[PDB]
Design a binder for this molecule. Structure first.
Ligand SMILES: [Zn+2]
Ligand SMILES: [Zn+2]
Lengths: 226, 226
C-alpha cells in the first residue's frame, strides 16, 4: 500500500520524446519526483538527466532496450546534483557516452557524484549541437553556477531543469548553491533562445507552457532585491 | 500521470480497525503522507486524527458512510498540527463529537486550526476511556508539548502519532516545537502503558512493531545530550 520504492514512470511527450519521472524516498515516507527526457535518434536514444540513484537509472536503461527498442547511447546532464547526475556511474558502466558542462564535471566529486566523461564545448552563442537534434544551451548561473538547459526546437520543447520552477511555485526552492542576482537573466536568456517553444518542462511536476518563464523570472527578481 | 491531488486511501489493520492515509501536495510536486485511524464501534465509528485539509477529511466522512456503512460519530486528535487537526471544521459541520487535549485546544487557533469541541479529562494514570474501546493516554511532552497517544489494548495496537518516528528514521524530524528533554520519557511511558501491543502505528509510513519504540527513544536520547 505504502511502497518504499516506486518504479520509474515513462510518459510520451511528443513523437520521439519521452519524459521519465523517478521518486526519491524521504524519511517521512513521502516522495519527491524528478523529470528527465529520453529522445529517440534513429535506432538509439539520448538520455537527458539520470534518476536519483543507480538502480533507478538502471530501470531507464533497461526500459530503453526492452520497451523502446532504442537503447540509450548518449547522455547529458543539466547540473551536478543527485537528481540529475545521481546515476552517472550506471551509465558509464554500460558504455554510454556521457556529457556535462565543464563546471558540472569539476564539482561532481565534491557533491558525491560520478562526473561525466566528456566536457561540453560551447560555441560563442553558448550552444552545442553535439547531441543533435538536441540544442544544449548554457544560460549562465541560476539554480546553480553550472546549470544548462536542453531545447528541442524542431518539436517546440524546452527542458529547463531546476532552472525553471514547477508550476504553482511560490518560492525558488533550495537556494543554497544559487546565484540570485543572475537567475532572472538566465531564465530570460532561455526564453529568448527558444522563443517559439510552447512546451516547457521543469525538473519537478508537470510540463506546462511559457508561463513557467514568467513565474521563475518574477520569483527570481523578487529574491534578488534586498 | 502526476496528479496534484490523490484520494485518501483506507487500509484494514485488524478487524474493526482501519488506517486512513492522506497526502499533502508540496511545491516540488512531491507528496507527504499522514496516517490516522477509523475504529468501528457498533453501528458507528471513531476517527483518530483528520486528514491534511477539510476536503480530504470530507472523503473520510463519506467513506465511513458509503463504504464502511458505519458513519463517524466521534473524533479525537493527537496534537494541534495541520496533519492531525487540519479538518476539524469539516467534522464539526457534520455534528461529529470532537475531543482533544486541553493544551491542543488552547494551541489550535494560534496555529491556524479549528479547535476540538471538548477537552479530554484524564484520570490519575493519565488515561481516559471516554472513547472506549480506545484508551487515550497522555505521556507528556515530546514531539509537541500537547501530544497524546491512542491505544487499542484488546487488539494490541498503539497509534503513536508524531510521538513515534517512522521506521528507517535517522532524525527526530520537525523539532521546532519539541521537548527534546522529555521526548524519550514520553516514548517509554507509552511503551510501558501498552506493554503487550505488538502493532505500533506512527504518523508517517507503514505500521511496524515495538522496535519503533527503541528507534524513537534512541534518537531522542541522542538529541537530548548537548
Ligand atoms: Zn539542483
Ligand atoms: Zn506535528
Amino acid at each position: 500500500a505504502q511502497p518504499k520504492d516506486v518504479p520509474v514512470t515513462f510518459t510520451a511527450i511528443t513523437q520521439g520524446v519521452w519524459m521519465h519521472t523517478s521518486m526519491k524516498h524521504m524519511e517521512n515516507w513521502g516522495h519527491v519526483p524528478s523529470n528527465g527526457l529520453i529522445v529517440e535518434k534513429g535506432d538509439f536514444s539520448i538520455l537527458v538527466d539520470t534518476a536519483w540513484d543507480d538502480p533507478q537509472t538502471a530501470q531507464i536503461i533497461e526500459w530503453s532496450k526492452d520497451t523502446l527498442k532504442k537503447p540509450i547511447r548518449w547522455a547529458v546532464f543539466t547540473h551536478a546534483h543527485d537528481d540529475k547526475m545521481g546515476g552517472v556511474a550506471a551509465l558509464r558502466q554500460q558504455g554510454i557516452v556521457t556529457y556535462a558542462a565543464a563546471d558540472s564535471n569539476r564539482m561532481a566529486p565534491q557533491n558525491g557524484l560520478t562526473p561525466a566523461e566528456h566536457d561540453l564545448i560551447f560555441d560563442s552563442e553558448h550552444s552545442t549541437s553535439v547531441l543533435h537534434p538536441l540544442v544544449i544551451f548554457d544560460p549562465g548561473p541560476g539554480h546553480t553556477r553550472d546549470n544548462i538547459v536542453v531545447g528541442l526546437p524542431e518539436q517546440g520543447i524546452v527542458f529547463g531543469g531546476c532552472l525553471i520552477r514547477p508550476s504553482g511555485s511560490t518560492s525558488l526552492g533550495n537556494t543554497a548553491d544559487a546565484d540570485l542576482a543572475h537567475w532572472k537573466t538566465a531564465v530570460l536568456a532561455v526564453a529568448q533562445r527558444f522563443a517559439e517553444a510552447q512546451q516547457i518542462i521543469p525538473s519537478h511536476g508537470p510540463m506546462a507552457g511559457r508561463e513557467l518563464f514568467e513565474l521563475t523570472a518574477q520569483l527570481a527578481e523578487k529574491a534578488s532585491i534586498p
